[PDB]
């Protein structure tokens, strides 16, 4: 009877469950981005050269 009483209290709610455990954010908006890595330019050329 005492063992049965303990069984009923635990049965009502799991109490250890973690909502959305493990699964990550999944889709997450990403902004497209551009990063200049370096600039190459001629030095002291007459006028300018395209």
């Amino acid at each position: 009877e005492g063992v049965e009483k303990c069984i009923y209290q635990n049965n009502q709610i799991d109490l250890l469950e973690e909502y959305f455990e493990g699964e990550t954010s999944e889709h997450v908006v990403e902004n497209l981005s551009s990063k200049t890595l370096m600039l190459f330019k001629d030095e002291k050329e007459i006028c300018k050269r395209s």
């Binding site: 005492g2 063992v3 049965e4 303990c6 069984i7 009923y8 635990n10 799991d14 250890l16």
Partner: protein, 128 residues
């Protein structure tokens, strides 16, 4: 009369097995699903060491006079639960599972039944 309590313990949802221990440590009655006697001999030794250590520790280690542990519940990985209740000179261990565990057990039972049915069908085919 005594037999009905074992049937009643099985009837309660989330209950896997029940083990009863004497003061000496002999296991009076254990569930059929769980191993009988070999598991009971191994479970009785562990619970007595735990129950005796906890009962002794509460009285002296916590420095509280006339304080006695009534129920010990150990929650482990998966669905295992092992409530321990001591009545008179007899202490018993009850193993119950969570809802998910119970569902898994039911699914396993269904699978076993399906396998048995398939075997029966195969036997019938062989007979034919």
């Amino acid at each position: 009369n005594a037999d009905d309590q074992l049937k009643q313990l099985s009837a309660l949802e989330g209950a896997n097995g029940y083990v009863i221990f004497n003061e000496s440590g002999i296991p009076l009655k254990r569930h059929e699903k769980s191993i009988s006697h070999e598991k009971a001999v191994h479970i009785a030794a562990l619970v007595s060491d735990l129950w005796n250590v906890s009962k002794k520790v509460i009285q002296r280690d916590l420095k509280t006079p006339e304080n006695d542990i009534e129920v010990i519940r150990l929650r482990t990985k998966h669905s295992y639960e092992y409530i321990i209740t001591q009545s008179g000179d007899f202490t018993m261990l009850a193993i119950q599972l969570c809802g998910k565990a119970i569902e898994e057990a039911k699914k396993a039972a269904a699978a076993a039944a399906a396998a048995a049915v398939v075997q029966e069908e195969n036997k019938e085919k062989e007979k034919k």
